[PDB]
Design an enzyme around this catalytic site. Structure first.
Site, PDB file in Angstrom:
ATOM      1  NE  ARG A 262      -1.700   1.723   3.690  1.00  0.00           N
ATOM      2  CZ  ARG A 262      -1.946   1.641   4.994  1.00  0.00           C
ATOM      3  NH1 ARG A 262      -3.089   1.131   5.447  1.00  0.00           N
ATOM      4  NH2 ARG A 262      -1.030   2.051   5.851  1.00  0.00           N
TER       5      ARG A 262
ATOM      6  CD  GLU B 115     -10.364   1.369  13.546  1.00  0.00           C
ATOM      7  OE1 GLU B 115     -10.242   2.616  13.401  1.00  0.00           O
ATOM      8  OE2 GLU B 115      -9.806   0.733  14.441  1.00  0.00           O
TER       9      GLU B 115
ATOM     10  CG  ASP C  11     -12.587   6.661  10.264  1.00  0.00           C
ATOM     11  OD1 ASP C  11     -12.472   5.880   9.290  1.00  0.00           O
ATOM     12  OD2 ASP C  11     -11.586   6.884  10.978  1.00  0.00           O
TER      13      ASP C  11
HETATM   14  C1  LIG Z   1      -3.740   3.932  10.025  1.00  0.00           C
HETATM   15  C2  LIG Z   1      -4.611   3.106  10.968  1.00  0.00           C
HETATM   16  N1  LIG Z   1      -4.771   3.792  12.239  1.00  0.00           N
HETATM   17  C3  LIG Z   1      -5.859   4.529  12.416  1.00  0.00           C
HETATM   18  O1  LIG Z   1      -6.743   4.552  11.574  1.00  0.00           O
HETATM   19  C4  LIG Z   1      -5.978   5.313  13.697  1.00  0.00           C
HETATM   20  C5  LIG Z   1      -5.307   6.686  13.546  1.00  0.00           C
HETATM   21  C6  LIG Z   1      -5.973   7.510  12.481  1.00  0.00           C
HETATM   22  C7  LIG Z   1      -7.334   7.800  12.564  1.00  0.00           C
HETATM   23  C8  LIG Z   1      -7.955   8.545  11.568  1.00  0.00           C
HETATM   24  C9  LIG Z   1      -7.225   9.015  10.470  1.00  0.00           C
HETATM   25  C10 LIG Z   1      -7.884   9.787   9.411  1.00  0.00           C
HETATM   26  C11 LIG Z   1      -7.292  10.946   8.895  1.00  0.00           C
HETATM   27  C12 LIG Z   1      -7.920  11.675   7.890  1.00  0.00           C
HETATM   28  C13 LIG Z   1      -9.148  11.254   7.383  1.00  0.00           C
HETATM   29  C14 LIG Z   1      -9.745  10.101   7.886  1.00  0.00           C
HETATM   30  C15 LIG Z   1      -9.119   9.374   8.895  1.00  0.00           C
HETATM   31  C16 LIG Z   1      -5.856   8.726  10.399  1.00  0.00           C
HETATM   32  C17 LIG Z   1      -5.237   7.978  11.395  1.00  0.00           C
HETATM   33  C18 LIG Z   1      -5.329   4.563  14.869  1.00  0.00           C
HETATM   34  P1  LIG Z   1      -6.306   3.305  15.556  1.00  0.00           P
HETATM   35  O2  LIG Z   1      -7.354   2.925  14.559  1.00  0.00           O
HETATM   36  O3  LIG Z   1      -6.766   3.730  16.920  1.00  0.00           O
HETATM   37  C19 LIG Z   1      -5.321   1.879  15.669  1.00  0.00           C
HETATM   38  C20 LIG Z   1      -6.175   0.718  16.192  1.00  0.00           C
HETATM   39  N2  LIG Z   1      -4.161   2.061  16.532  1.00  0.00           N
HETATM   40  C21 LIG Z   1      -3.999   1.762  11.161  1.00  0.00           C
HETATM   41  O4  LIG Z   1      -3.603   1.426  12.279  1.00  0.00           O
HETATM   42  O5  LIG Z   1      -3.907   1.016  10.198  1.00  0.00           O
HETATM   43 ZN   LIG Z   2      -9.207   3.411  14.895  1.00  0.00          ZN
END
Ligand SMILES: C[C@H](NC(=O)[C@H](Cc1ccc(-c2ccccc2)cc1)CP(=O)(O)[C@H](C)N)C(=O)O
Ligand SMILES: [Zn+2]
Ligand SMILES: *[C@@H]1O[C@H](CO)[C@@H](O)[C@H](O)[C@H]1NC(C)=O
Ligand SMILES: *[C@@H]1O[C@H](CO)[C@@H](O)[C@H](O)[C@H]1NC(C)=O
Ligand SMILES: *[C@@H]1O[C@H](CO)[C@@H](O)[C@H](O)[C@H]1NC(C)=O
Length: 696
Positions: free
Chosen positions: A49, A593, A597
């Site tokens: 990815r 998730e 979001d």
């Molecule tokens: C990348 C992904 N992590 C996430 O989505 C969030 C952190 C996060 C949340 C929302 C966004 C986001 C940003 C912009 C638009 C939409 C969502 C980005 C990162 C962390 P988390 O889901 O709590 C994970 C379980 N540690 C992963 O672990 O694969």
């Molecule tokens: Zn999350």
């Protein structure tokens, strides 16, 4: 009133270059936000990815290389130890020179790999039992096969640890793969070929006779075995209710309610469990309390295991470890994994050695590496600004409770209780820089040889597992962070009721003290609300202010939560994903998730609106005919400019509990009246459906 600062010039340039203004925002905001990026970028051969987010990870590795690769005279031992570990990992000459020898010396210690021995029944089968063999791999090497026993936190008493029993992970990414037809055919074929190729290298190295037909025959029985296991495991959709998953028994109850007979024992849970825990001089009463996460699976196991030899079982068991070790041996062994990793990930080459190695040292010494990272790369006063943003978003969540029609008063109260009680962790623990003694002592019992990568990795497996086990009778440590600093991610913990924002994610496009507020809120602001909202998704709503699994919901409000959230199950379930062959997302497995979001987006935007109220509007960015409400959403979206290899899309549609980035964007904005206000979207435009889902 255009901002003309260099920091504004940097932001603007990045936003411009990613977007495609030729697309109508209201037709497809992902393409509008990201179409520039899409056209300019091709997924690297080493990436499954690739996207703005993955680029941040790549860029962090570059920092790790800089801070690991040069000895400095003042380095305390913790840092010396991480640099030596690094050095041992990147010395490919030293590794290639050892062939598979470091594996061969290990093999006798896990009761062998029958396929790749002579007279296994004579050497090993004698003393073999499943209690002993499963426990060895578990307790020494952290490898959990057939039956997954671990010490972890007690869901219902968050200060304590308890022994858990759960179904094991599989060699393929999900139970689905074991269908082994259609889109899964190549992976199943590569998996068995991979088994065979390794067994062959081992036999060749041992100067044993090689009979291809018998190779194929033994490894196919491994597959047939693991097929049955896979089919016996419970689906994620049936594991999503923590109250249902939590079954606390005694080892007595377990012995009496979940008997197994392997190789004709039958199977002693007391003995299995002590043969693990004996490893840290800890004694287990058949009257020990145990949390059993997968009763049905144990039940189904009984019939399966009775059909297989000890030799059969150990062929799978040892493969499941050897699987992981091969990429740490010489090139021929590294090589053997090629088709398998291509099938699962789509990649045609491994990542640069220094990158894999930087990550490995980071993963195993997160505090030492975090220290060097934040010293190199992390501002210092980012922390204070982020602390205040988190305060804001927490308030906005609290305040929003009052506008939510689907909860009653009491449940709202307890929800607020839980909000106020979330404990936040920003950047890094000051300890790791300020307390040399503590940091050294974390790694005291480790000592690395620069010419023995394999021994070093083994040492780490032994260390981390001995470390986890000894926690049984000890309290959970309330100081402890759930992530290192040098990580591009954020976290919520339900047991700890804690949100964590490692330094690694506190940078553009998410955050900078120097970038526009609209960008900060639509980025890191959204991430903060996402993590908070996890305390209240279909999992973390079952846990209370102190991280205990206890129902603080009324019947009605709990039924209403399900109703509100069902809208998102259907919305996202209805997304089909070209890269995954047209398959629909799993709207149940991504639910948590997706809730985070959609909630987080609303929370962040509200917090920005409040910012503007209090502080006035921001100067516009040059080169962009957008206002700051529009920019908030633009930046939000561009977090997920990116794409997937088809092979990996097939993987993550099953294994990732997140929606793929493009649907995170489309999903959440589809649900945002605010988005559609900002871009003047017609009713029932694609981005603006009349029916919108809302939970938080
Ligand atoms: C990348 C992904 N992590 C996430 O989505 C969030 C952190 C996060 C949340 C929302 C966004 C986001 C940003 C912009 C638009 C939409 C969502 C980005 C990162 C962390 P988390 O889901 O709590 C994970 C379980 N540690 C992963 O672990 O694969
Ligand atoms: Zn999350
Ligand atoms: C790699 O390790 C070998 C062990 O013999 C050593 O001779 C060599 O100098 C090492 N390479 C580097 C550059 O560290
Ligand atoms: C477990 O049972 C086996 C059966 O042979 C026995 O040999 C061993 O001593 C036992 N181990 C423990 C920890 O009781
Ligand atoms: C698609 O959405 C419709 C409307 O709610 C729903 O009936 C259907 O079950 C959804 N499909 C999936 C797989 O989510």
């Amino acid at each position: 009133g255009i901002c003309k600062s260099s920091d504004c010039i940097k932001s603007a340039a990045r936003l411009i270059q990613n977007m495609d203004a030729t697309t109508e925002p209201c037709t497809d905001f992902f393409k509008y936000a990201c179409g520039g990026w899409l056209k300019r970028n091709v997924i690297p051969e080493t990436s499954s990815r690739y996207g703005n987010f993955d680029i941040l990870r790549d860029e962090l590795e570059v920092v790790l290389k800089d801070v690991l690769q040069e000895p400095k005279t003042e380095d305390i031992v913790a840092v010396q130890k991480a640099k030596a570990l690094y050095r041992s990992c990147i010395n490919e000459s030293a590794i290639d020179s050892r062939g598979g020898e470091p594996l061969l010396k290990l093999l006798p210690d896990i009761y062998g790999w029958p396929v790749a021995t002579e007279n296994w029944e004579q050497k090993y089968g004698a003393s073999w039992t499943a209690e002993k063999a499963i426990a060895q791999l578990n307790s020494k090497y952290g490898k959990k096969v057939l039956i997954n026993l671990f010490v972890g936190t007690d869901d219902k008493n968050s200060v304590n640890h308890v022994i858990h029993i759960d179904q094991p992970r599989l060699g393929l990414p999900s139970r689905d793969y074991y269908e082994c037809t259609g889109i899964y055919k190549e992976a199943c074929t590569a998996y068995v070929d991979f088994m065979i190729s390794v067994a062959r290298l081992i036999r060749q190295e041992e100067r044993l006779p090689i009979d291809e037909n018998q190779l194929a025959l033994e490894m196919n029985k491994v597959m047939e075995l693991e097929k049955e296991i896979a089919n016996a495991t419970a689906k994620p959709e049936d594991r999503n209710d923590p109250m249902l998953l939590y079954n606390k028994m005694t080892l007595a109850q377990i012995q009496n309610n979940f008997s197994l007979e392997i190789n004709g024992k039958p199977f002693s849970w007391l003995n299995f469990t002590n043969e693990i825990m004996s490893t840290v001089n800890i004694s287990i009463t058949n009257e020990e309390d145990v949390v059993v996460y997968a009763p049905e699976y144990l039940t189904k196991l009984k019939p399966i295991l009775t059909k297989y030899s000890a030799r059969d079982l150990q062929n799978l068991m040892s493969w499941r470890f050897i699987m992981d070790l091969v990429s740490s041996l010489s090139r021929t062994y590294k090589e053997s994994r090629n088709a398998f990793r291509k099938a699962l990930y789509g990649t045609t080459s491994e990542t640069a050695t220094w990158r894999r190695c930087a990550n490995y040292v980071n993963g195993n010494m997160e505090n030492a590496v975090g220290r060097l990272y934040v010293e190199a790369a992390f501002a210092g006063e980012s922390k204070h600004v982020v602390e205040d943003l988190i305060a804001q978003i927490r308030e906005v969540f609290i305040q929003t409770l009052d506008d939510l029609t689907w909860m009653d008063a009491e449940t709202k109260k307890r929800a607020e209780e839980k909000a106020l009680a979330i404990k936040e962790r920003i950047g890094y623990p000051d300890d790791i820089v300020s307390n040399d003694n503590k940091l050294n002592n974390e790694y005291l019992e480790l000592n690395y040889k620069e010419d023995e990568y394999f021994e070093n990795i083994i040492q780490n497996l032994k260390f981390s597992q001995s470390k986890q086990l000894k926690k049984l009778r000890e309290k959970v440590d309330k100081d402890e962070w759930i992530s290192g600093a040098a990580v591009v991610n954020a976290f919520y913990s339900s047991g700890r009721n804690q949100i964590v924002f490692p330094a690694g994610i506190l940078q553009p496009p998410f955050f900078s003290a120097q970038q526009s507020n609209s960008l900060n809120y639509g980025g890191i602001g959204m991430v903060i609300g996402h993590e908070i909202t996890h305390g209240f998704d279909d999992n973390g709503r079952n846990f209370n202010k102190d991280g205990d699994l206890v129902d603080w919901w009324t019947q009605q409000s709990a039924s209403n939560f399900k109703e509100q959230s069902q809208c998102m199950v259907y919305q996202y379930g209805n997304f089909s994903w070209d890269l995954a062959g047209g398959q629909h997302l799993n709207g149940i497995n991504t639910l948590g998730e997706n809730i985070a979001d959609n909630g987080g987006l609303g929370q962040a935007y509200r917090a920005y609106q409040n910012y503007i109220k209090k502080n006035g509007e921001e100067k516009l960015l040059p080169g962009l005919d957008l206002n700051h409400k529009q920019l908030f959403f633009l930046n939000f979206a561009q977090v997920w400019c990116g794409t997937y290899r088809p092979e990996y899309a097939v993987n993550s549609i099953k294994t990732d509990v997140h929606s793929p980035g493009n649907f995170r964007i489309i999903g959440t904005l589809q649900n945002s009246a605010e988005f559609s206000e900002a871009f003047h979207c017609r009713k029932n435009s694609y981005m603006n459906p009349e029916k919108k889902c809302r939970v938080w």
